[PDB]
């Protein structure tokens, strides 16, 4: 599902 490290954009 959708998730990201805080310093990265979504895919």
């Amino acid at each position: 599902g959708l998730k990201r490290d805080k310093t990265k954009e979504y895919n």
Epitope: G1, L2, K3, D5, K6, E9, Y10
Partner: antibody, heavy 124, light 108 residues
């Protein structure tokens, strides 16, 4: 205590462009968050419109609106913006701005902090 | 898009009773499911995410469960202040979509 506040016209004529501003306090737009627009229809259904990243041009939009929506930001004013073109009565809704949720170093596209909602009617 | 459907549309229960709200996804969303509470005149408030993790400070009477296509929000003992519309939202893929809400009314 990040706070969001929508502003803009409450009445838009059919075929014209709906514009709204979200002013943010208690935090910077230029931050590691996506800033979102959501609307709630008179029947109480909720629809996600799209988002914009605080630290790049990255945007995601609902494909049902992609042809007529634009989200932008002005980090000198700490604001972000919604423009929805070619509106009709089906666009009458309460429009909310919101900041997505982060806990520690992980973020998810769910909404933590919301504005108060801007009521917009599309009518002649 | 993935479509979220909620049932029942409305619930009317006495204080102290357990409310069980259901959310169904049209395809599996695994655990990428959140719940919100919306009181009159207010924006929605995030309650639960990852199907079962409570937002910080949330009263323990709110609990989320489920996986895949079937999810539940439980309010273990209703209180008068719990009057609201409750919505689910997936975040499995784009676009994000919401269920149509369950309105919880309090008997007295």
């Amino acid at each position: 205590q990040v706070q969001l506040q929508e502003s803009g016209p409450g009445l838009v004529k059919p075929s014209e462009t709906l514009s709204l501003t979200c002013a943010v306090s208690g935090g910077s737009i230029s931050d590691y968050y996506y800033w979102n627009w959501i609307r709630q229809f008179p029947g109480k259904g909720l629809e996600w419109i799209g988002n914009i990243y605080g630290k790049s041009a990255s945007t995601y939009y609902n494909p049902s609106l992609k042809s007529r929506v634009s989200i932008s930001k002005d980090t000198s004013k700490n604001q972000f913006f919604l423009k929805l073109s070619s509106v009709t009565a089906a666009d009458t809704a309460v429009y909310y701005c919101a900041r997505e949720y982060c806990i520690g170093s992980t973020c998810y596209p769910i909404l933590d902090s919301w504005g108060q909602g801007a009521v917009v009617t599309v009518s002649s | 898009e993935i479509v979220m459907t909620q049932s029942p549309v409305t619930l009317s229960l006495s204080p102290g009773e357990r409310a069980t709200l259901s959310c169904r996804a049209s395809q599996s969303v695994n655990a990428s499911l959140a719940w919100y509470q919306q009181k009159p005149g207010q924006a929605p408030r995030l309650l639960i995410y990852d199907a079962s993790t409570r937002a910080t400070g949330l009263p323990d009477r709110f609990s989320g469960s489920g996986s895949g296509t079937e999810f539940t929000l439980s309010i273990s003992s209703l209180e008068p202040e719990d009057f609201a519309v409750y919505y689910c939202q997936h975040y499995f893929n784009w676009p994000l979509t919401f269920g149509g809400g369950t309105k919880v009314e309090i008997k007295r």
